[PDB]
Amino acid sequence: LTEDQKQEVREAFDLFDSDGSGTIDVKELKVAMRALGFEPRKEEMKKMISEVDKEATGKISFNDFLAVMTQKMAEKDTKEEILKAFRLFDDDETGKISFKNLKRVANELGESLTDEELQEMIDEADRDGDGEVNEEEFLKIMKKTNLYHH
Ligand SMILES: [Ca+2]
Ligand SMILES: [Ca+2]
Ligand SMILES: [Ca+2]
Ligand SMILES: [Ca+2]
């Protein structure tokens, strides 16, 4: 759930609803997201259209619009918190988390993890195989990990 921001979501809906019909188009959806500071991803969009409207109407209600905007503003906060955590591990700021980086912070927070258990963490996140974890890869394991923690 969003808080005071749904008043801003309402303002963006009414403005790009030319008719005042209480419904917007697929073409009107993407500009209203752009107005609220969100660049709609093309791959992300096709799943969104199907999720808010199954029938061949092409209409999007305010409640549909509040639903997509809530997850987008939630994703933005989730991403920013993940990247805040990413900078904690990559303290030498090379752009990648090494085994030495992960071990150092594990000892600093007093985590009861051995060298083998820490290295397994690197290898599962390491999708490309260079032995270190970059920004793209760290975002992948973190959304997986969010499933376990709430
Ligand atoms: Ca309309
Ligand atoms: Ca609908
Ligand atoms: Ca590093
Ligand atoms: Ca890597």
From Swiss-Prot:
Tissue: Expressed in testis. Localizes to the caudal portion of spermatozoa in seminiferous tubule and epididymis. Expressed in retina photoreceptor cells (at protein level).
InterPro entries, per database record: CALM/Myosin/TropC-like, EF-hand-dom_pair, EF_Hand_1_Ca_BS, EF_hand_dom, RNA-helicase_DEAD-box_CS
UniProt entry tagged with the keyword Metal-binding: yes
MF terms (GO), sorted A to Z: calcium ion binding; G-protein beta/gamma-subunit complex binding; heterotrimeric G-protein binding; microtubule binding
First-listed, main subcellular location of the protein, grouped into a coarse class: cytoplasm
Note from the entry: Binds two moles of calcium per mole of protein.
Protein name: Centrin-1
Native organism: Mus musculus (Mouse)
Biological classification of the source: Eukaryota, Metazoa, Chordata, Craniata, Vertebrata
